[PDB]
Amino acid sequence: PRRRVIGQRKILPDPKFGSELLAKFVNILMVDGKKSTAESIVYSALETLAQRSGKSELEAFEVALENVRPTVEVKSRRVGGSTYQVPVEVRPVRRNALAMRWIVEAARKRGDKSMALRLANELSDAAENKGTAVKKREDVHRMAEANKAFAHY
Amino acid sequence: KFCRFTAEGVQEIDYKDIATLKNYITESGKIVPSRITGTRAKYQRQLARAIKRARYLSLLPYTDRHQ
Amino acid sequence: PVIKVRENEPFDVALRRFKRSCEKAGVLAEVRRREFYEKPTTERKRAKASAVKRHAKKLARENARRTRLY
Amino acid sequence: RKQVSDGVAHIHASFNNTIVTITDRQGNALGWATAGGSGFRGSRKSTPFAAQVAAERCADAVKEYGIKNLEVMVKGPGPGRESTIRALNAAGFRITNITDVTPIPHNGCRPPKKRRV
RNA sequence: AAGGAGGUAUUCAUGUU
RNA sequence: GCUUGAGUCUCGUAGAGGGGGGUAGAAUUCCAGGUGUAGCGGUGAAAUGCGUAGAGAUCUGGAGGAAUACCGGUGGCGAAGGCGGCCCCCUGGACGAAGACUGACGCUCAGGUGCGAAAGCGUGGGGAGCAAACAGGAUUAGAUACCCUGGUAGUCCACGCCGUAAACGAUGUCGACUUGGAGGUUGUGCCCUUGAGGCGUGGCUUCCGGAGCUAACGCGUUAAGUCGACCGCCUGGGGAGUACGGCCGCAAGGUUAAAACUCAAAUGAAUUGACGGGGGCCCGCACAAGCGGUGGAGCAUGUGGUUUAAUUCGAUGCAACGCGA
Ligand SMILES: [Mg+2]
Ligand SMILES: [Mg+2]
Ligand SMILES: [Mg+2]
Ligand SMILES: [Mg+2]
Ligand SMILES: [Mg+2]
Ligand SMILES: [Mg+2]
Ligand SMILES: [Mg+2]
Ligand SMILES: [Mg+2]
Ligand SMILES: [Mg+2]
Ligand SMILES: [Mg+2]
Ligand SMILES: [Mg+2]
Ligand SMILES: [Mg+2]
Ligand SMILES: [Mg+2]
Ligand SMILES: [Mg+2]
Ligand SMILES: [Mg+2]
Ligand SMILES: [Mg+2]
Ligand SMILES: [Mg+2]
Ligand SMILES: [Mg+2]
Ligand SMILES: [Mg+2]
Ligand SMILES: [Mg+2]
Ligand SMILES: [Mg+2]
Ligand SMILES: [Mg+2]
Ligand SMILES: [Mg+2]
């Protein structure tokens, strides 16, 4: 908006976990407004991931999310007539959103059968730092370093 | 402001007076403008002639990348 | 613009000091103006126009500093 | 091979390209590096980053001589003009002098004509 | 290159630096 | 006859005013040598070009030509063109102070004479850099250009010729009178210079502005105001500053300067819009950040086209095409 500085909409916490971050994850996963199905998938995936990789669902989810969070991204400025790909530091709320979005899309792509199984596998893989999501994060970091020469435009 | 020469009623710069010329030159060796220094126009011209004569006699450097 | 690193002087401070010295010397401006040959007519015209612009805005400020903005 | 532990870094920084040359105090050149050798071409070789990597390449080249002290002579109106100095400091030489040696004429030869673009 | 301040711009002890 | 206009003398002041001759440092180029090695150079991007016979870079020495950074200033000087490192020689003008002197010796000026940027011409030198022409590489539909790499006349010097410029303040020279303000520059008088100050009195110069003038724009004590003296020039636009003739010129050409024919306008200033690959400011799912699509498949539907005896007619950039229906 040219003239509007209202912030972000207040979102309610997750019923079964009281986590705003988890609620946003459910919203990102949800498609066609079918929140019940997405919530069941994430709950089952979290329980499976907890049993496999550690102690509690929130701890496993946060460690995976941190392993996927990007420090810096790149945007396309246009000052010298041509377009310069310049790196830019991402604000923390955007870090969480990008991490969750990357995890969800990577899980969708995977070839496993059940969506909950795909989500649990991807979360564990991201925690172990071999997943497609962490690969995506490393790719964006790699490109940012490549075009770091334009960091003062 | 505060033209120094007219304060003492100086008639001529007397280029042999190096210390005054050192005040009225920059570190790089060029002449500081009268706009910055505050010197009057007549004394500025006399000062420029004195500095150039001193540069020829090698009492002042033309530049700092000379010797 | 000769600069020698002073005793107990940080390198970043020294580098900023060197840039300040170069700015005061006016080296980049001089070489850039000497990059191409400006005709004497162009030089005189440019100088005169700049003086006119400076004088005009001085008068404008000194006059319009006696008006009600609101 | 003959260790001297003090060098002079001549940084010729033109608009198009930057050439860094490490030499002895007397004038004999030890090693050099340029953005063209760094691989950047044209619009990318006229950037400060290319100058930085060329300075790093030159520092590696003259690493055999084991030079510790380094006085810097920067010359020409080049895009970087400073990234080379930062790169040398990062490479780990003690920068002794930072000197500008741009050749400014006292109204000498006539420059080429102005470009009409 | 971008933002802030002062002016038509300097006096603002030298020393120090 | 007189001294107020004009001029002379006495003492000083500032100035890139002019001519001649030396000299200084920076820088470019080239040459010789050392170090050192694979790029340099150039552009929006490239190539031509240069470099392994060693470039570019870096250091040392040498040669040569041209021009004088900073100071530098809507600062100064000159009739105008124009004049910019420093020093010396020759030389012109302007201004201030106090007086003394001559006694209208003044102003303007057709012909005439001289000076007169740059380019150009003749003869002879010089030649670093720059650079018409030219050569090559690009760009483009074409590119006899803009861009890039080279590059000859020329630019420099001596002596002649040329004599034209938006040679412009687009404002002829001389003189007198008419409210002001802020500056710059250069003299000079007085007041305790109460220390950089205060009050006068000249010369030149920039801006703003009153009356007045002007078509308006604007000028405005440096007039485009109110007047006086002399000179030059205009008579609608094109044809045309062209033809012919004369004069000048080595030439290029310059100067003086028409007519037929043709049109009913050509022009100046200012006004309201629209536009600008002008400038500032602002807004809109305009972009950006996101989610979901269309464009691929099948089918439904509308249109175009083609076909038909008829495929009824209309809507057909956005703002027609599941529209009238
Ligand atoms: Mg060029
Ligand atoms: Mg004058
Ligand atoms: Mg006559
Ligand atoms: Mg000529
Ligand atoms: Mg000739
Ligand atoms: Mg000749
Ligand atoms: Mg050319
Ligand atoms: Mg050339
Ligand atoms: Mg004429
Ligand atoms: Mg003229
Ligand atoms: Mg005329
Ligand atoms: Mg006359
Ligand atoms: Mg006026
Ligand atoms: Mg004629
Ligand atoms: Mg003509
Ligand atoms: Mg004739
Ligand atoms: Mg809306
Ligand atoms: Mg979009
Ligand atoms: Mg289709
Ligand atoms: Mg159609
Ligand atoms: Mg129809
Ligand atoms: Mg129809
Ligand atoms: Mg519709």
Coordinates of all heavy atoms in Angstrom, one line a residue, chain F residues 206-228:
Chain F
rU206 P 28.2 45.6 -15.0 OP1 28.1 44.8 -16.3 OP2 27.6 46.9 -14.9 O5' 27.7 44.7 -13.8 C5' 27.8 43.3 -13.9 C4' 27.2 42.6 -12.7 O4' 27.7 43.1 -11.5 C3' 25.7 42.8 -12.6 O3' 24.9 42.0 -13.4 C2' 25.5 42.6 -11.1 O2' 25.3 41.2 -10.8 C1' 26.8 43.1 -10.5 N1 26.6 44.5 -10.0 C2 25.8 44.7 -8.8 O2 25.4 43.7 -8.2 N3 25.7 45.9 -8.4 C4 26.2 47.1 -9.0 O4 25.9 48.2 -8.5 C5 26.9 46.8 -10.2 C6 27.1 45.6 -10.6
rC207 P 23.4 42.4 -13.8 OP1 22.9 41.4 -14.7 OP2 23.4 43.8 -14.1 O5' 22.6 42.2 -12.4 C5' 22.3 40.9 -11.9 C4' 21.8 41.0 -10.5 O4' 22.6 41.9 -9.7 C3' 20.4 41.7 -10.4 O3' 19.3 40.8 -10.7 C2' 20.4 42.1 -8.9 O2' 20.1 41.1 -8.0 C1' 21.8 42.5 -8.7 N1 22.1 44.0 -8.8 C2 21.6 44.8 -7.8 O2 21.1 44.4 -6.8 N3 21.8 46.2 -7.9 C4 22.4 46.6 -9.0 N4 22.6 48.0 -9.1 C5 22.9 45.8 -10.0 C6 22.7 44.5 -9.9
rC208 P 18.0 41.3 -11.3 OP1 17.1 40.2 -11.6 OP2 18.3 42.4 -12.3 O5' 17.3 42.1 -10.1 C5' 16.8 41.4 -9.0 C4' 16.2 42.3 -7.9 O4' 17.3 43.1 -7.3 C3' 15.2 43.3 -8.4 O3' 13.9 42.7 -8.6 C2' 15.2 44.4 -7.3 O2' 14.5 44.0 -6.2 C1' 16.7 44.4 -6.9 N1 17.5 45.5 -7.6 C2 17.4 46.7 -7.0 O2 16.8 46.9 -5.9 N3 18.1 47.7 -7.5 C4 18.8 47.5 -8.6 N4 19.4 48.6 -9.2 C5 18.9 46.3 -9.3 C6 18.2 45.3 -8.7
rG209 P 12.9 43.3 -9.6 OP1 11.6 42.5 -9.5 OP2 13.5 43.5 -10.9 O5' 12.5 44.8 -9.1 C5' 11.7 45.0 -7.9 C4' 11.8 46.4 -7.4 O4' 13.2 46.7 -7.2 C3' 11.3 47.5 -8.3 O3' 9.9 47.7 -8.2 C2' 12.1 48.7 -7.8 O2' 11.5 49.2 -6.6 C1' 13.4 48.1 -7.5 N9 14.4 48.1 -8.6 C8 14.7 47.1 -9.5 N7 15.5 47.4 -10.4 C5 15.8 48.7 -10.1 C6 16.7 49.6 -10.8 O6 17.4 49.4 -11.8 N1 16.7 50.9 -10.2 C2 15.9 51.2 -9.2 N2 16.1 52.5 -8.8 N3 15.1 50.4 -8.5 C4 15.1 49.2 -9.1
rG210 P 9.0 48.5 -9.3 OP1 7.6 48.1 -9.1 OP2 9.7 48.4 -10.6 O5' 9.2 50.0 -8.8 C5' 8.6 50.4 -7.5 C4' 8.6 51.9 -7.4 O4' 9.9 52.5 -7.2 C3' 8.1 52.7 -8.7 O3' 6.7 52.7 -8.8 C2' 8.7 54.0 -8.5 O2' 7.9 54.8 -7.7 C1' 10.0 53.7 -7.8 N9 11.2 53.7 -8.7 C8 11.9 52.6 -9.2 N7 12.9 52.9 -10.0 C5 12.9 54.3 -10.0 C6 13.8 55.2 -10.6 O6 14.7 55.0 -11.4 N1 13.4 56.5 -10.4 C2 12.4 56.9 -9.6 N2 12.2 58.2 -9.4 N3 11.6 56.1 -9.0 C4 11.9 54.8 -9.2
rA211 P 6.0 52.7 -10.3 OP1 4.6 52.3 -10.1 OP2 6.9 51.9 -11.2 O5' 6.1 54.2 -10.7 C5' 5.6 55.3 -9.9 C4' 6.1 56.6 -10.3 O4' 7.6 56.6 -10.1 C3' 6.0 57.0 -11.8 O3' 4.7 57.6 -12.0 C2' 7.2 58.0 -12.0 O2' 6.9 59.3 -11.6 C1' 8.2 57.4 -11.0 N9 9.2 56.5 -11.7 C8 9.3 55.1 -11.6 N7 10.3 54.6 -12.3 C5 10.9 55.7 -12.9 C6 11.9 55.8 -13.8 N6 12.6 54.7 -14.2 N1 12.3 57.0 -14.2 C2 11.6 58.1 -13.8 N3 10.5 58.1 -13.0 C4 10.2 56.9 -12.6
rG212 P 4.0 57.3 -13.4 OP1 2.9 58.3 -13.6 OP2 3.6 55.9 -13.4 O5' 5.0 57.5 -14.6 C5' 5.4 58.8 -15.0 C4' 6.6 58.8 -15.9 O4' 7.7 58.2 -15.3 C3' 6.4 57.9 -17.2 O3' 5.7 58.6 -18.2 C2' 7.8 57.5 -17.5 O2' 8.5 58.6 -18.2 C1' 8.4 57.4 -16.1 N9 8.4 56.0 -15.6 C8 7.4 55.5 -14.8 N7 7.6 54.3 -14.5 C5 8.7 53.9 -15.2 C6 9.4 52.7 -15.3 O6 9.1 51.6 -14.8 N1 10.5 52.7 -16.2 C2 10.9 53.9 -16.8 N2 12.0 53.7 -17.6 N3 10.3 55.0 -16.7 C4 9.2 55.0 -15.9
rC213 P 4.7 57.8 -19.2 OP1 4.0 58.8 -20.0 OP2 3.9 56.8 -18.3 O5' 5.7 56.9 -20.1 C5' 6.6 57.6 -21.0 C4' 7.6 56.6 -21.5 O4' 8.4 56.0 -20.4 C3' 7.0 55.4 -22.2 O3' 6.7 55.7 -23.6 C2' 8.1 54.4 -22.1 O2' 9.1 54.6 -23.0 C1' 8.7 54.7 -20.7 N1 8.1 53.8 -19.6 C2 8.6 52.5 -19.5 O2 9.5 52.1 -20.2 N3 8.1 51.7 -18.5 C4 7.1 52.2 -17.7 N4 6.6 51.4 -16.8 C5 6.5 53.5 -17.9 C6 7.1 54.3 -18.8
rU214 P 5.4 55.0 -24.3 OP1 5.2 55.6 -25.6 OP2 4.3 55.0 -23.3 O5' 5.9 53.5 -24.4 C5' 7.0 53.1 -25.2 C4' 7.3 51.7 -25.1 O4' 7.7 51.3 -23.8 C3' 6.1 50.7 -25.3 O3' 5.8 50.6 -26.7 C2' 6.6 49.4 -24.7 O2' 7.5 48.7 -25.5 C1' 7.3 50.0 -23.5 N1 6.5 50.0 -22.2 C2 6.6 48.9 -21.4 O2 7.3 48.0 -21.7 N3 5.8 49.0 -20.3 C4 5.0 50.1 -19.9 O4 4.4 50.0 -18.8 C5 5.0 51.2 -20.8 C6 5.8 51.1 -21.9
rA215 P 4.3 50.6 -27.2 OP1 4.2 50.2 -28.7 OP2 3.6 51.8 -26.8 O5' 3.6 49.4 -26.4 C5' 2.2 49.1 -26.6 C4' 1.9 47.6 -26.7 O4' 2.5 47.2 -27.9 C3' 2.6 46.8 -25.6 O3' 1.8 46.7 -24.4 C2' 2.8 45.4 -26.3 O2' 1.6 44.7 -26.3 C1' 3.0 45.9 -27.7 N9 4.5 45.9 -28.0 C8 5.3 47.0 -28.0 N7 6.5 46.7 -28.3 C5 6.5 45.3 -28.5 C6 7.5 44.4 -28.8 N6 8.8 44.8 -29.0 N1 7.2 43.1 -29.0 C2 5.9 42.8 -28.8 N3 4.9 43.6 -28.4 C4 5.2 44.8 -28.3
rA216 P 2.3 47.4 -23.1 OP1 1.1 48.0 -22.4 OP2 3.4 48.2 -23.4 O5' 2.8 46.2 -22.2 C5' 1.9 45.1 -21.9 C4' 2.6 43.8 -22.3 O4' 3.0 43.9 -23.7 C3' 3.8 43.3 -21.5 O3' 3.5 42.7 -20.3 C2' 4.5 42.4 -22.5 O2' 3.9 41.2 -22.5 C1' 4.2 43.1 -23.8 N9 5.3 44.1 -24.2 C8 5.3 45.5 -24.0 N7 6.4 46.1 -24.4 C5 7.1 45.0 -25.0 C6 8.4 45.0 -25.6 N6 9.1 46.1 -25.8 N1 8.9 43.8 -26.0 C2 8.1 42.7 -25.8 N3 6.9 42.6 -25.3 C4 6.5 43.8 -24.9
rC217 P 4.6 42.9 -19.0 OP1 3.9 42.2 -17.9 OP2 4.9 44.3 -18.9 O5' 5.9 42.1 -19.5 C5' 5.8 40.7 -19.6 C4' 7.0 40.2 -20.5 O4' 7.0 40.8 -21.7 C3' 8.3 40.4 -19.9 O3' 8.7 39.4 -18.9 C2' 9.2 40.2 -21.1 O2' 9.3 38.9 -21.5 C1' 8.4 41.0 -22.2 N1 8.7 42.4 -22.3 C2 9.9 42.8 -22.8 O2 10.7 42.0 -23.2 N3 10.2 44.2 -22.8 C4 9.3 45.0 -22.4 N4 9.6 46.3 -22.4 C5 8.0 44.6 -21.8 C6 7.8 43.3 -21.8
rG218 P 9.5 39.9 -17.6 OP1 9.7 38.8 -16.6 OP2 8.9 41.2 -17.1 O5' 10.9 40.3 -18.2 C5' 11.8 41.2 -17.7 C4' 12.1 42.3 -18.7 O4' 10.9 42.9 -19.1 C3' 12.9 43.5 -18.1 O3' 14.3 43.2 -18.1 C2' 12.6 44.6 -19.1 O2' 13.3 44.5 -20.3 C1' 11.1 44.3 -19.4 N9 10.2 45.1 -18.5 C8 9.4 44.6 -17.6 N7 8.6 45.5 -17.0 C5 9.0 46.7 -17.7 C6 8.5 48.0 -17.5 O6 7.7 48.5 -16.8 N1 9.2 48.9 -18.4 C2 10.1 48.5 -19.4 N2 10.6 49.5 -20.1 N3 10.5 47.3 -19.5 C4 9.9 46.4 -18.7
rC219 P 15.3 43.9 -17.1 OP1 16.7 43.3 -17.3 OP2 14.7 44.0 -15.8 O5' 15.4 45.4 -17.7 C5' 16.2 45.8 -18.8 C4' 16.1 47.3 -19.0 O4' 14.8 47.7 -19.3 C3' 16.6 48.2 -17.9 O3' 18.0 48.4 -17.8 C2' 15.8 49.5 -18.2 O2' 16.5 50.2 -19.3 C1' 14.5 49.0 -18.8 N1 13.5 48.9 -17.7 C2 12.8 50.1 -17.4 O2 13.1 51.1 -18.1 N3 11.9 50.1 -16.5 C4 11.6 48.9 -15.8 N4 10.7 49.0 -14.9 C5 12.3 47.7 -16.1 C6 13.2 47.8 -17.0
rG220 P 18.7 48.4 -16.4 OP1 20.1 48.7 -16.6 OP2 18.3 47.2 -15.7 O5' 18.0 49.6 -15.6 C5' 18.2 51.0 -16.0 C4' 17.1 51.9 -15.5 O4' 15.8 51.3 -15.8 C3' 17.1 52.2 -14.0 O3' 18.1 53.2 -13.7 C2' 15.7 52.6 -13.8 O2' 15.5 53.9 -14.1 C1' 15.0 51.7 -14.7 N9 14.5 50.4 -14.0 C8 15.2 49.2 -14.0 N7 14.6 48.3 -13.2 C5 13.5 49.0 -12.8 C6 12.4 48.5 -11.9 O6 12.3 47.4 -11.4 N1 11.5 49.5 -11.7 C2 11.5 50.8 -12.2 N2 10.5 51.6 -11.8 N3 12.5 51.2 -13.0 C4 13.4 50.3 -13.2
rU221 P 19.3 52.8 -12.7 OP1 20.0 51.7 -13.2 OP2 18.7 52.8 -11.3 O5' 20.2 54.1 -12.8 C5' 20.9 54.4 -14.0 C4' 21.7 55.7 -13.8 O4' 20.8 56.8 -13.7 C3' 22.6 55.8 -12.6 O3' 23.8 56.5 -12.9 C2' 21.7 56.5 -11.6 O2' 22.4 57.2 -10.6 C1' 21.0 57.5 -12.5 N1 19.7 58.0 -12.0 C2 19.6 59.2 -11.4 O2 20.6 59.9 -11.2 N3 18.4 59.5 -10.9 C4 17.2 58.8 -11.1 O4 16.2 59.3 -10.6 C5 17.4 57.6 -11.8 C6 18.6 57.2 -12.2
rU222 P 25.2 55.7 -13.0 OP1 25.3 54.7 -11.9 OP2 26.2 56.7 -13.2 O5' 25.0 54.9 -14.4 C5' 25.3 55.5 -15.7 C4' 25.3 54.5 -16.8 O4' 26.3 53.5 -16.4 C3' 24.0 53.8 -17.1 O3' 23.9 53.5 -18.5 C2' 24.2 52.5 -16.3 O2' 23.4 51.4 -16.8 C1' 25.7 52.2 -16.5 N1 26.2 51.3 -15.4 C2 26.8 50.1 -15.8 O2 26.8 49.7 -16.9 N3 27.3 49.4 -14.7 C4 27.3 49.7 -13.4 O4 27.8 49.0 -12.6 C5 26.7 51.0 -13.1 C6 26.2 51.8 -14.1
rA223 P 23.0 54.4 -19.4 OP1 23.1 53.9 -20.8 OP2 23.3 55.8 -19.1 O5' 21.5 54.2 -18.8 C5' 21.0 52.9 -18.7 C4' 19.7 52.7 -19.4 O4' 18.6 53.0 -18.4 C3' 19.4 53.6 -20.5 O3' 18.7 52.9 -21.5 C2' 18.5 54.7 -20.0 O2' 17.7 55.4 -20.9 C1' 17.7 53.9 -19.0 N9 17.0 54.7 -17.9 C8 15.7 54.5 -17.6 N7 15.2 55.3 -16.7 C5 16.3 56.1 -16.4 C6 16.5 57.1 -15.5 N6 15.6 57.6 -14.7 N1 17.7 57.7 -15.5 C2 18.7 57.3 -16.3 N3 18.6 56.3 -17.2 C4 17.4 55.7 -17.2
rA224 P 19.3 52.7 -23.0 OP1 20.3 51.6 -23.0 OP2 19.7 54.0 -23.5 O5' 18.0 52.3 -23.9 C5' 17.2 53.2 -24.6 C4' 15.8 53.0 -24.2 O4' 15.4 51.7 -24.4 C3' 15.4 53.4 -22.8 O3' 14.1 54.0 -22.7 C2' 15.4 52.1 -22.0 O2' 14.6 52.0 -20.9 C1' 14.9 51.1 -23.1 N9 15.4 49.8 -23.0 C8 16.6 49.3 -23.3 N7 16.8 48.0 -23.1 C5 15.6 47.6 -22.6 C6 15.1 46.4 -22.2 N6 15.8 45.3 -22.2 N1 13.8 46.3 -21.8 C2 13.1 47.4 -21.8 N3 13.4 48.6 -22.2 C4 14.7 48.7 -22.5
rG225 P 13.8 55.5 -23.2 OP1 12.7 55.4 -24.2 OP2 15.1 56.1 -23.6 O5' 13.3 56.2 -21.9 C5' 12.1 55.9 -21.3 C4' 11.9 56.7 -20.0 O4' 12.9 56.4 -19.1 C3' 11.9 58.2 -20.2 O3' 10.7 58.7 -20.7 C2' 12.2 58.7 -18.8 O2' 11.1 58.6 -17.9 C1' 13.3 57.6 -18.4 N9 14.7 57.9 -18.7 C8 15.6 57.2 -19.3 N7 16.8 57.6 -19.4 C5 16.7 58.8 -18.7 C6 17.7 59.8 -18.4 O6 18.9 59.8 -18.8 N1 17.2 60.8 -17.7 C2 15.9 60.9 -17.2 N2 15.6 62.0 -16.5 N3 15.0 60.1 -17.5 C4 15.4 59.0 -18.2
rU226 P 10.6 59.5 -22.1 OP1 9.2 59.6 -22.5 OP2 11.6 59.0 -23.0 O5' 11.1 61.0 -21.6 C5' 10.3 61.8 -20.8 C4' 11.0 63.1 -20.4 O4' 12.1 62.8 -19.6 C3' 11.5 63.8 -21.7 O3' 10.5 64.6 -22.3 C2' 12.6 64.6 -21.1 O2' 12.1 65.8 -20.4 C1' 13.1 63.7 -20.0 N1 14.3 62.9 -20.4 C2 15.6 63.4 -20.1 O2 15.7 64.5 -19.6 N3 16.6 62.7 -20.5 C4 16.6 61.4 -21.1 O4 17.6 60.9 -21.4 C5 15.3 61.0 -21.3 C6 14.2 61.7 -21.0
rC227 P 10.6 64.9 -23.9 OP1 9.4 65.6 -24.3 OP2 11.1 63.7 -24.6 O5' 11.8 66.0 -23.9 C5' 12.8 65.8 -24.9 C4' 14.0 66.7 -24.6 O4' 14.8 66.1 -23.5 C3' 15.0 66.9 -25.7 O3' 14.6 67.9 -26.7 C2' 16.3 67.3 -25.0 O2' 16.3 68.6 -24.5 C1' 16.2 66.4 -23.7 N1 16.9 65.1 -23.8 C2 18.3 65.1 -23.5 O2 18.8 66.2 -23.2 N3 19.0 64.0 -23.7 C4 18.4 62.9 -24.0 N4 19.2 61.8 -24.1 C5 17.0 62.8 -24.3 C6 16.3 63.9 -24.2
rG228 P 14.9 67.6 -28.2 OP1 14.1 68.6 -29.0 OP2 14.9 66.2 -28.5 O5' 16.5 68.1 -28.4 C5' 16.8 69.4 -28.1 C4' 18.3 69.6 -28.0 O4' 18.8 68.9 -26.9 C3' 19.2 69.1 -29.1 O3' 19.1 69.9 -30.3 C2' 20.5 68.9 -28.5 O2' 21.2 70.1 -28.4 C1' 20.1 68.5 -27.1 N9 20.2 67.0 -26.9 C8 19.1 66.1 -27.0 N7 19.5 64.9 -27.0 C5 20.9 64.9 -27.0 C6 21.9 63.9 -27.0 O6 21.7 62.7 -26.9 N1 23.2 64.4 -26.9 C2 23.5 65.7 -26.9 N2 24.8 66.0 -26.9 N3 22.6 66.7 -27.0 C4 21.3 66.2 -27.0

